[PDB]
Structure formats: C-alpha cells, structure tokens
Amino acid sequence: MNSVTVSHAPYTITYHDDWEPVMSQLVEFYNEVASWLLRDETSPIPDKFFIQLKQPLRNKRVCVCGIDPYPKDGTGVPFESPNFTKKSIKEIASSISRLTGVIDYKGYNLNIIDGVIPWNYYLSCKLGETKSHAIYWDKISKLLLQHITKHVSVLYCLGKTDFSNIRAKLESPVTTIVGYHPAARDRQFEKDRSFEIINVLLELDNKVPINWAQGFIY
Amino acid sequence: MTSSADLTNLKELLSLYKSLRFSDSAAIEKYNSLVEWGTSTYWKIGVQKV
Numbered sequence: 001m002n003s004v005t006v007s008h009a010p011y012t013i014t015y016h017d018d019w020e021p022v023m024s025q026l027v028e029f030y031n032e033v034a035s036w037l038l039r040d041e042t043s044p045i046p047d048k049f050f051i052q053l054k055q056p057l058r059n060k061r062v063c064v065c066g067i068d069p070y071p072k073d074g075t076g077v078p079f080e081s082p083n084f085t086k087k088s089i090k091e092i093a094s095s096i097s098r099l100t101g102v103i104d105y106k107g108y109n110l111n112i113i114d115g116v117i118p119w120n121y122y123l124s125c126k127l128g129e130t131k132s133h134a135i136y137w138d139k140i141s142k143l144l145l146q147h148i149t150k151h152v153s154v155l156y157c158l159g160k161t162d163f164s165n166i167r168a169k170l171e172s173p174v175t176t177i178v179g180y181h182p183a184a185r186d187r188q189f190e191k192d193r194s195f196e197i198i199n200v201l202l203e204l205d206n207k208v209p210i211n212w213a214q215g216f217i218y
Numbered sequence: 219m220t221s222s223a224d225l226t227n228l229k230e231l232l233s234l235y236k237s238l239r240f241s242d243s244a245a246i247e248k249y250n251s252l253v254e255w256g257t258s259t260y261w262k263i264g265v266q267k268v
C-alpha cells in the first residue's frame with residue numbers, strides 16, 4: 001500500500017503496488033477535473049472514489065464492470081450494499097442462488113470472491129443521477145480499465161446500452177462479454193447466463209473458473 | 219453474448235478443445251468455425267484455429 005497526493009478531495013489516493021504504472025497519469029487527470037466534479041454531492045463520497053485501487057490485480061481472472069455507482073449510497077466498492085438492500089445486488093445474488101443451489105443467505109458481495117475485481121467504468125455520479133459525471137471521468141476511465149484488462153482473462157460488462165461501444169475504449173483485445181443490467185426489462189437479467197459463460201471462457205484460456213458462491217454472506 | 223445459446227456453443231467448443239482428435243472433416247470444420255464465432259463474439263478467446 002502506497003499513496004499519492006492530489007490537489008482536490010480526497011487529496012490522498014492509496015493504492016496496491018499492482019496499480020503503480022498508472023498512478024502518475026491518474027494524478028494529472030484527476031487534478032484537471034476534480035474541482036468541477038466536486039461542485040456536486042456525489043455517490044460515493046470523494047473519500048471512497050478510489051478505494052478499489054487497494055485491490056491487487058495480479059491474482060484477478062475476471063473484471064465485473066458496471067457503468068457507475070448506485071445513484072445513492074455508493075460505498076466505492078461496485079455493487080456493494082452493506083445491509084443487502086439495493087435491487088441490483090439482490091438480483092445478482094438470486095442468479096447465483098439459482099446457479100449454485102445456495103438458497104439461504106443474508107447477503108452478497110462481488111468483492112469477496114477470489115479472482116474477481118468488481119469495477120465501475122465511471123467512479124462517481126452526482127447524487128441521484130446516473131452517468132452525470134461521464135464527461136469528467138472519460139480519460140481516467142480508459143486509463144484504469146485498460147490497466148485492469150492487462151491482468152484479467154475476462155471482462156464482463158453489465159448493461160447492453162451502456163457498454164455497446166466498450167471495445168473502442170480499449171487498446172489490446174481482451175475477452176469481453178456484455179450482458180444485461182440487473183434492471184433490464186422482461187426479466188432479461190434473470191435469463192442471462194453470463195456467470196456460467198465467464199467460466200467456460202476461463203477454461204478455454206486454461207484458467208480456474210470463478211467460485212461464484214464465495215460471494216455469499218451468511 | 220448473453221444467452222443460453224451462447225453458453226451451449228462455448229461448451230461445445232470446450233469439449234472439442236479437450237479432444238483435439240478430429241476423425242473427420244466435420245468435426246475439424248466445426249471446431250474452427252466455433253473458434254471464429256467465439257473470437258468475433260467475445261473479441262478474444264483463449265483457443266486458436268487448427
């Protein structure tokens with residue numbers, strides 16, 4: 001755990017060694033935009049924008065990527081709902097329940113699964129308004145997602161519309177699956193087999209499949 | 219990318235990858251056509267045409 005200093009809240013960014021190559025560029029990009037973005041109240045709070053940079057990358061097989069945080073109550077960990085109250089994480093948990101046959105559980109978190117890094121393409125939104133900070137994060141979002149995708153075997157993006165152009169944001173090709181957002185019409189997320197697909201793709205790359213049941217909180 | 223159909227094709231690609239002992243033209247053409255579909259659909263996959 002290292003840190004670097006920026007000129008706007010949160011002022012310090014703490015990061016695991018595996019992120020070192022992007023940190024000086026992150027500092028330059030964040031400094032040019034942060035004052036604008038800080039004019040709004042955000043999800044998450046500025047002190048949590050970068051908490052996922054504390055995760056290692058070298059042990060990661062899969063990135064699970066949403067577009068931006070919960071409009072409210074973002075923790076800085078994508079999809080994380082401490083008291084298991086947000087619809088998206090409950091839907092993700094029901095899919096994994098159906099997949100694994102675990103029926104009794106009290107919560108689910110993508111961030112406690114071996115080999116998985118949950119990620120948000122944009123690192124904040126103005127409170128209550130999805131994608132409101134797309135314009136600020138743009139260059140940072142590319143920088144960080146490109147770095148992640150040097151390490152993972154599979155990128156799984158949630159949201160057909162949101163991620164329709166994701167390939168243009170990446171330099172090197174990476175295995176990329178775009179599935180439905182948990183709130184898609186017509187129970188489309190329920191029918192989606194992305195978690196299983198990710199595992200077959202991992203096997204095709206001689207990697208160990210993800211144990212999705214590790215996400216459960218009991 | 220999403221679907222039960224996609225999953226079925228990938229599983230079949232994986233099964234053929236694990237054999238790699240093609241006894242006819244059909245199986246080898248299937249394997250290679252699945253590679254092409256997988257690569258187009260997911261951008262990059264871990265196996266290669268033979």
Ligand SMILES: O=c1cc[nH]c(=O)[nH]1
Pocket residue numbers: 065066067068069070074077078079080088120158
């Ligand atoms: O962190 C989150 C929460 C909901 N949806 C997302 O895309 N990301």
